[PDB]
Amino acid sequence: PISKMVTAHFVLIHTICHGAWIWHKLKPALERAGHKVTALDMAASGIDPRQIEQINSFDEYSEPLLTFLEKLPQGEKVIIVGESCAGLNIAIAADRYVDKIAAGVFHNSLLPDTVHSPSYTVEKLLESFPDWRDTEYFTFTNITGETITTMKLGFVLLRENLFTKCTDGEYELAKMVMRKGSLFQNVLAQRPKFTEKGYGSIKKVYIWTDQDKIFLPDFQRWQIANYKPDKVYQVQGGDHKLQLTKTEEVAHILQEVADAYA
Amino acid sequence: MVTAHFVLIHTICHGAWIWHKLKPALERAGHKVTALDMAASGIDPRQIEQINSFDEYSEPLLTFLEKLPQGEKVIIVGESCAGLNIAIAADRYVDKIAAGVFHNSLLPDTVHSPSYTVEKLLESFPDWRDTEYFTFTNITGETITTMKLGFVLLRENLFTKCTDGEYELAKMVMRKGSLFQNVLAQRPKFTEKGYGSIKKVYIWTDQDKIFLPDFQRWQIANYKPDKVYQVQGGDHKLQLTKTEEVAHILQEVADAYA
Amino acid sequence: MVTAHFVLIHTICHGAWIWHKLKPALERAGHKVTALDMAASGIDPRQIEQINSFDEYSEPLLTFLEKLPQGEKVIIVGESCAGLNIAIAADRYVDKIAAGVFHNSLLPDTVHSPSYTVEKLLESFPDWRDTEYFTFTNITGETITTMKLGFVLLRENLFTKCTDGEYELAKMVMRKGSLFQNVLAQRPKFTEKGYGSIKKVYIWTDQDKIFLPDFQRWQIANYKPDKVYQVQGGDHKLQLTKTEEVAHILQEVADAYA
Amino acid sequence: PISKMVTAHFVLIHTICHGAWIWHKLKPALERAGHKVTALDMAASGIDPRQIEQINSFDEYSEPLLTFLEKLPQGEKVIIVGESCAGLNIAIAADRYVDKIAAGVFHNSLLPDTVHSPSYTVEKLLESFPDWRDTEYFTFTNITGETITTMKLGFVLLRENLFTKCTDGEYELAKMVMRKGSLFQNVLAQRPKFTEKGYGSIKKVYIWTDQDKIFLPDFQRWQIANYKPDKVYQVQGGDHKLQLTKTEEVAHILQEVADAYA
């Protein structure tokens, strides 16, 4: 009748332990479509200089995103794409900059809600996937005395559960730059719920595959049932790291999102 | 077929990650591979300002070699400035090294000071385009010049023929680095008994757009390697653009030296 | 008599060494004593430029307390700026601390930001005479001001009545330090449940020539300690000029709090 | 007939593992007499920023002394006072700056000679005192592949053998600032002998006590017999650290040295 195609500014946010580097194939694919893409390292992730023992909450961890949104020009809006635990970074960011977010895209991601604790989907994630195989755990005491659990993701868990169908070069890259991370789950349990006016009002698109071997179909479908997304896009095949195994397909879905919300 | 243990050493500002394609290639031939981050490089936790010389920068390689089990030998492959890491390492552990492989790399000698090929590189390629420079004073008071490689120089000179996913990765994890040139100028020359006695294989391509053809041929003429292999085409990052070729030359190095 | 485990914390630029007279004194009364070097202080191997905040500077104290065996409690004695180390530590390990003792020290509060008493010190004593200042940018981009304490300020203001052997020792091992004032200004206030709940003993002398009488009385008025002991005479380094007095007050703190 | 009293510039050099700090009582006592005193930290000692694993020989370790002598003004001369292993620093310095040295004073110190290897008195020291009790040993490989043995001096050895009669405050100070050190004995074994023209020509005064519990009377007297000092001053009592236990007495002997050579 009237067709529409839109170019957008995507901000890509990795999950804990990883960095901007997992977006190294999706970032060019999106730029081939003419989109502007920013891929940020969160605190103590990728080549960010901080160490995780200096970080005290998931909010503090999210500082690079919030700084970047604080600096966005007047009336510029971005679509925040977050993989895995980064749905929590999208929720933190939307309660401070609802204004600047055209949509949040959850890519095999935690989908927080406003009705329960911020730690709620992390609890459910761990109920669904309680054993992280050869992952190693550590702790430190944060700035107000909370015990924080950090982890060094195991290489078998990396191979078989996160990077299941990925290229040898991609899995090897992951071993060369993977760092420690934390869910800050007990500090999330103490956190104010996400608000209705900020995060609750954001458009939310949920991309996932039922071939994900760590965010399992049962968990993903429970999340979709728990907090209905505005749109759901299920990709066939691939693995947890769809921006590596299904890069073009994820780019085409993200075009659709830009058309609809940006 | 000799299977060998290869220790891969990235150049300044980079990290173990530039070998993410070459390490699986070599492991598919049954070789053992170790890819190390040097100090303040890749995900190493130190920042460049706490490193005071190229010998301190080499610490992850020297500690590795320090702990290598008795009677084990490795082939150390160094790209670009990492030939200085090979020479430093070879003077301390000549015993542990089956051969040094120089991959579009500086090839230090024993006759001139440690900074000599750095001076010659800078002479052949003096303008590093959009690279930015910084300085700090190290613990003994020397001014160290650091750099942040410019993205145009990365696109056109280092990663010339690389895939868009590889160039993007490079911009996502590249860090500041230093040649410690002036500290190298003050360093004792590499010894004959250590670095001079090591077997030396030089791999290059004439399509390298930063280690230019006449600098590499100068280097070969200045201090003749045991073997030179020239790969056709590719770019400076042959372990990315010609990964299988480099893996096949390294099988020949393994076969020749174990 | 309660014997106690005391953790002694020097101020910026100093090291565990300023307690070399007080630690034996206390050990002669059967107490256990730990004297720690903070980051980049005494013989700690780090340099000030790799430290990015006062919380990072406190790391040796926090690691110590992290590892303290379950159910053990300590009395932390902090001199001069080390009251900020007490407050940082108390918010993380309130449980492990029988009391904080402030020895001619900053006494932080919960109501105002962490830099408040630093601002007030600098207001009461703005000219640090021959002290030299330097700056570096920390990893998150803040400019940190460091200082090298001037020897006249050391002789007349800090070590006023100290022996010539003690003043000389001070010049032989003193290092650069930092208040990280601006990072403190951005830090969350000390909590009520942690630092606010700790028992607090304030020891001072009115002959202190850098933490002047009206600044110390201001501090006491601004955030009233559980107990204040005033030593007659001496100087800023009461653990050097009045070592036995300080040891006797610390026995009373041990008796009062274990 | 004619009496003479002279003021001198003393450069005080600590032994391995220690720093300029062991001179904190002798330096004021000498300044009370009107002398100029410089007390230097050698590489990786005292608050010197280098670590011992970055140091590759006893000569490199001696860099702060040599830099300081390179900077001495024209025709200025110093008396170098070295305790324990610092006689080797006096010997290194005298083969480069014989010109600038009025005398070398060996204070319960190694007394190198020119006829044997630089490591020779270290060998004899270890023959005489082979067990360093609770001392811990470590190694690293230096710049040309030599194995270097470093040590962290034990606290019992410190208490009973080096700081035998010292004050509690002095022994405690020593535990608070003692660092790792090395004899670099195998690199000294490979070193050119000390020369006759430089080090062999220096005036040499030997101060010692037979109450020293680590540089034992048998070793000290063997050294005196092996390379006759120009003057020997035996202090009664005290311990290894005569600049702490016999500070005034050592200062009075050093006045005598200044009168005679400076």
Curated annotation (Swiss-Prot), chains B, C:
Pfam families: Abhydrolase_1 (PF00561). 2-hydroxy-2-methylpropanenitrile binds at residues 11, 80. This enzyme can be used as a biocatalyst for stereoselective synthesis of a wide array of (S)-cyanohydrins by addition of HCN to aldehydes or ketones. Optically active cyanohydrins are interesting intermediates for the synthesis of alpha-hydroxy acids, alpha-hydroxy ketones, or beta-ethanolamines, all of which are important building blocks in organic synthesis. It comes from the Eukaryota. Involved in cyanogenesis, the release of HCN from cyanogenic glycosides in injured tissues; the release of toxic HCN is believed to play a central role in the defense mechanism of plants against herbivores and microbial attack. Decomposes a variety of cyanohydrins (alpha-hydroxynitriles) into HCN and the corresponding aldehydes or ketones; two natural substrates are 2-hydroxy-2-methylpropanenitrile (acetone cyanohydrin) and 2-hydroxy-2-methylbutanenitrile (2-butanone cyanohydrin), but in vitro can also act on 2-hydroxy-2-methylpentanenitrile (2-pentanone cyanohydrin) and mandelonitrile. The active site is at residues 80, 236. This is (S)-hydroxynitrile lyase. It comes from Manihot esculenta. One of its GO terms (molecular function) is aromatic (S)-hydroxynitrile lyase activity. The record marks 208 as: Increases basicity of active site His.
